[PDB]
Amino acid sequence: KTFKQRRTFEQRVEDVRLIREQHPTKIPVIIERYKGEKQLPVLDKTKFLVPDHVNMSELIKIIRRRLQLNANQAFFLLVNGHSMVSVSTPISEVYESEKDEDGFLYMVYASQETF
């Protein structure tokens, strides 16, 4: 059901390697809705190629636009399983410290802080 359950470790490693070859300036990001989530919709896809210069604040704005949220819908985003310490960090720096061993950066979103 989740991305890690659908694709083998070997398969995830090879897809990150192909994104390095074909989209060298992009961060490979997995974005999934929290399994408990009621309010927010699901995304149109799972795997996202994020320009490596954007910061976490801008990525949140990007995901809010993709979900077509309105101003008063709450949105919380975990990176590698935990809260972001700072939204100002360039995603290239976030990737180097928070990437999975498969080479993806994993994110989860919910309408509540308590996931």
Ligand SMILES: CC(=O)Nc1ccc(CN2CCOCC2)cc1
């Ligand atoms: C596109 C891409 O990133 N490819 C890739 C392929 C293999 C590795 C693993 N290497 C093998 C040779 O040296 C030891 C570690 C890393 C990256």
Ligand SMILES: [Cl-]
């Ligand atoms: Cl690129």
